Amino acid sequence: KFCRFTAEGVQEIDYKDIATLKNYITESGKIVPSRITGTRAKYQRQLARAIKRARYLSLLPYTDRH
Amino acid sequence: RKQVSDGVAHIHASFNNTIVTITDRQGNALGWATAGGSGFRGSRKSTPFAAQVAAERCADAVKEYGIKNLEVMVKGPGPGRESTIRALNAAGFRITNITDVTPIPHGCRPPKKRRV
Amino acid sequence: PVIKVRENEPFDVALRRFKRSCEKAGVLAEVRRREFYEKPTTERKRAKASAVKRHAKKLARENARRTRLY
Amino acid sequence: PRRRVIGQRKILPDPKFGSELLAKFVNILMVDGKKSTAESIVYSALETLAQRSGKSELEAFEVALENVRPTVEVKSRRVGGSTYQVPVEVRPVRRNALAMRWIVEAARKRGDKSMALRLANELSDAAENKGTAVKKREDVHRMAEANKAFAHY
RNA sequence: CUUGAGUCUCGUAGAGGGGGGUAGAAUUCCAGGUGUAGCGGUGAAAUGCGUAGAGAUCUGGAGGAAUACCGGUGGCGAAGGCGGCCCCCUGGACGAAGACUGACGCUCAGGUGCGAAAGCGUGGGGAGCAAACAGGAUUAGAUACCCUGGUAGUCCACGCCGUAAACGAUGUCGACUUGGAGGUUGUGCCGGCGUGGCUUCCGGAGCUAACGCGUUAAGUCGACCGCCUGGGGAGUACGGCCGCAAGGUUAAAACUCAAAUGAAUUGACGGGGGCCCGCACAAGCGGUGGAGCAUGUGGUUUAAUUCGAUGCAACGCGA
Ligand SMILES: [Mg+2]
Ligand SMILES: [Mg+2]
Ligand SMILES: [Mg+2]
Ligand SMILES: [Mg+2]
Ligand SMILES: [Mg+2]
Ligand SMILES: [Mg+2]
Ligand SMILES: [Mg+2]
Ligand SMILES: [Mg+2]
Ligand SMILES: [Mg+2]
Ligand SMILES: [Mg+2]
Ligand SMILES: [Mg+2]
Ligand SMILES: [Mg+2]
Ligand SMILES: [Mg+2]
Ligand SMILES: [Mg+2]
Ligand SMILES: [Mg+2]
Ligand SMILES: [Mg+2]
Ligand SMILES: [Mg+2]
Ligand SMILES: [Mg+2]
Ligand SMILES: [Mg+2]
Ligand SMILES: [Mg+2]
């Protein structure tokens, strides 16, 4: 488990932080469930909100078959 | 007529049939074979063995192009997904890649459920 | 599920890597679910029925540790 | 049956050639419990089969079995109301049982007069892939090829 | 007067709502390239599509509609409902520390508003799906189920309709009455110790006809409202009101029955599930059904063709 955003006192997940964001998407570009990454429900919503913002700016891929 | 030595095998594995198309890397189809055209009709057509025979004929059908290595793009849920890839390796192609390209809407309304 | 056949990997292990990579992505699970329209009423019932049984099995297993068979 | 409990029944070996294989052939040929009658037919066919190829009494019967023994057959099975014929590998003991049975029923429906000769002509025909038994073998094998797709439950 | 009710200050989470914009995937179609004989569909088929070049694959374009993953007996909303991302307008809930008002409250017939889907009107749009419809099957028949297509509709704007198993089949408000395990969202003090809101399951007393409910009560009580009085006839007729219509709403009676009903119990049954068995299948061998005759029966005939047995379990049976 160990939601790392609660342990590091995060306040926003900042879609620009691609190094952090790529740890929560699979090889095919899909958001990983909080049941797998142990993220707490509050930050998982911010995490998904951040990832969809980075996908729009092409900082992250929607799929692996682009 | 023309030599290539670098092809892509598109396996189209549906529940009812398997279509094997060997294209060149720019997508120009060199040859193709289907399970339905291999002498398998109806129930036989949807079998991994029939899809295997389809790959054997598509390897023969693109023989004069001298293809040495091949990429494998598998599309669809049908029984002849993995059956076709082993038959393409068995024919004598060196498989460079195996990728899934099955389309997923992120879409249109699917047809209504069958009441059988 | 993209697989690159790496250097000095036999085919059978490389093909096993492909089937495993496809199941993690759930491509076959997603395809079968999308071939027929699922009413919102039924997609919510199957969602509720899945949770209700996974909860009951968790409860009914825990008291199995509290009970002997012989 | 629903419970395996089928220890076979010892079978004495052919009195003349001491061949446990050939005793079963007599048993397959036998009618009405008339074993003495069947052994005479088998013995007079084997001598005729031997002196027609000169090989020997026993392995002339063995080389005919080779062309009749199946290696694969279909078993019935229904899936959606329709019947799926599933090819299945014949085990070694049943390969001999089918070979002997095919030869005898191939012989029985022949035009020769005496079954002794009538059998030897079939055992001779199978020696070069010509008779009805080898025809009945190739008919089984092609169906196991036509139905080869269904080799899984 | 301040405890009920409300106002203010700081923050929190949220698919709450209305407007606008935009992204990626996918389907379809259009044009072009490669290519050649099938594709599609089914339990199996056929209708259909294809040598006028399909399907497959690639390139570019058009268009509509829905937002995979996240996603969660998670969240928000009075309910109906609400899900990509961004902006604009806007509603509510909640928490901490106080300040303020000073019963300003609760409930609510009539009335007003909101209210899924289908449907109606006017004008757009139309990819996919798909009532109607057409064909192919299946079938004794098949106004179906299945297949191939396919129009209204589904989408947008504005208006109407006002009904749903609109369900927690559980009116709203307030108080009190053992616990356990979670979810979600604040907050205080030092992962621990508390304290609030909402929510899921289990369970005690109690209650219940039982099933079950059980601090989110179906427990113990108080305030107000709605509704019921056997089944059918019937939420029907007539009338009124409402609606463009479809219809909604309010709402009988004659007549008829002696029950209708709820919950649980024991069986039996299921084209429910699980586990077993049996010449039950499977694997084999020999028969019967054809022939002649023997024998029994049915029927017919007769003066009488004595009576009885007459699915399995009568018919070389009483005999
Ligand atoms: Mg369909
Ligand atoms: Mg009120
Ligand atoms: Mg009223
Ligand atoms: Mg509508
Ligand atoms: Mg309209
Ligand atoms: Mg119009
Ligand atoms: Mg249809
Ligand atoms: Mg009603
Ligand atoms: Mg409900
Ligand atoms: Mg009601
Ligand atoms: Mg309970
Ligand atoms: Mg009425
Ligand atoms: Mg009226
Ligand atoms: Mg049998
Ligand atoms: Mg007879
Ligand atoms: Mg009588
Ligand atoms: Mg009597
Ligand atoms: Mg009688
Ligand atoms: Mg009896
Ligand atoms: Mg008897």
Question: CA of C45 vs C1' of E250, distance in Å?
Answer: 38
Do B10 and B75 form a contact (C-beta atoms < 8 A)?
yes
Q: How far apart are CA D28 and CA D81, in angstroms?
A: 36
Chain B residue with minimal CA distance to A28?
Answer: B100
Query: Which bases in strand E are touched by protein, i.e. have an atom under 7 Å from a CB?
Result: 13-15, 22-27, 33-45, 55-59, 64-74, 84-86, 127-130, 145-147, 183-186, 191, 200-202, 276-286
Q: How far apart are CA B54 and CA C43, in angstroms?
A: 38
Cβ of residue A17 lies below 7 Å from strand E:
no
Sequence-ordered alpha helix ranges (H) in chain B: 48-61, 82-91
Look at chain D and report how many structural domains it folds into.
Answer: 1
Q: How far apart are CA B101 and CA C52, in angstroms?
A: 35
Angle (nearest 5°) at CA D12 between D9 and D13: 135
Q: How far apart are CA D148 and CA D86, in angstroms?
A: 7
Cα diameter, chain D: 55
The tokens describing C23, both together, are: 């199941």
Do B13 and B51 form a contact (C-beta atoms < 8 A)?
yes
- Using the mean position of ligand 10's atoms as its centre, give its distance from the Cα of residue C58 in Å: 36
Angle (nearest 5°) at CA D114 between D109 and D116: 90
Do D123 and D64 form a contact (C-beta atoms < 8 A)?
yes
Alpha carbon of B24: minimum distance to chain D alpha carbons (Å): 31
Q: How far apart are CA A57 and CA A59, in angstroms?
A: 5
How many contiguous H segments (helices) and E segments (strands) does chain A have? 4, 0
Long-range residue pairs from B17-20, CB within 8 A, at least 24 positions apart, any chain: B17/B45, B17/B46, B17/B78, B18/B50, B18/B51, B18/B54, B18/B78, B18/B80, B18/B84, B19/B54, B20/B51, B20/B54, B20/B55, B20/B57, B20/B58, B20/B84, B20/B88
| D150 Cβ under 8 Å from any chain B Cβ | yes
Q: How far apart are CA D124 and CA D143, in angstroms?
A: 26
Q: Which amino acid is at D96?
A: N
Chain C residue with minimal CA distance to B103?
Answer: C31
C-alpha distances in Å from residue A54, one per residue of A3, A61, B23, B54: 21, 8, 35, 43
* Residue-range definition of the domain harbouring residue D62: 20-147
The tokens describing C65, both together, are: 């540790």
Q: How far apart are CA B116 and CA A29, in angstroms?
A: 37
Q: How far apart are CA D132 and CA D106, in angstroms?
A: 6
- Residues D87, D91, D95, D97, CA torsion sign: negative
User: Domain ranges in chain A?
Assistant: 1-66
Q: Which nucleotide is nearest to B111 (CA to C1')?
A: E129
* SS3 call for B70: strand
β-pair partners for B94: B69
User: Domain ranges in chain C?
Assistant: 1-56
C-alpha distances in Å from residue C49, one per residue of C31, C52, C62, D14, D153: 22, 5, 20, 69, 31
Q: Is residue D7 part of a domain?
A: no
CATH number where D30 lies: 1.10.455.10
Q: Is residue D100 part of a domain?
A: yes
Q: Is residue D140 part of a domain?
A: yes
β-pair partners for D134: none
Q: How far apart are CA C26 and CA C17, in angstroms?
A: 14
Q: Is residue D121 part of a domain?
A: yes
- Residue C58 CB neighbours (<10 A): 9
Q: Is residue D9 part of a domain?
A: no
C-alpha D29: how far from chain center = 11
Q: How far apart are CA B32 and CA B49, in angstroms?
A: 17
Q: Which nucleotide is nearest to C47 (CA to C1')?
A: E73
Question: CA of A34 vs C1' of E105, distance in Å?
Answer: 47
What residues contact B59, with CB distance under 8 A and at least 6 apart?
Answer: B22, B87, B88, B91, B92, B93
Sequence-ordered alpha helix ranges (H) in chain C: 11-25, 27-33, 40-62
Residues of B near A (CB-CB distance < 8 A)? Answer: 99, 101, 106
Q: Is residue D45 part of a domain?
A: yes
Do B6 and B67 form a contact (C-beta atoms < 8 A)?
yes
Interaxial angle between packed helices C11-25 and B82-91, expressed in degrees from 0 to 180 and rounded to the nearest 10: 160
* Contacts with B105 from chain C: Cβ below 8 Å: 34
The tokens describing B55, both together, are: 């790959």
Contact check, Cβ <8 Å, C11/B95: yes
Q: How far apart are CA D1 and CA D141, in angstroms?
A: 28
Q: Is residue D4 part of a domain?
A: no
- Residue C59 CB neighbours (<10 A): 9
Q: How far apart are CA D152 and CA B52, in angstroms?
A: 15
Burial class (CB in 10 A: 0-12, 13-18, 19+), B102: buried
Q: How far apart are CA D37 and CA D29, in angstroms?
A: 10
Task: Please report the resolution in angstroms.
Answer: 2.6
Q: What are phi and psi of D104, to 5 degrees?
A: -70, -40
Cα diameter, chain B: 51
C-alpha distances in Å from residue C35, one per residue of B13, B110, D140: 15, 6, 40
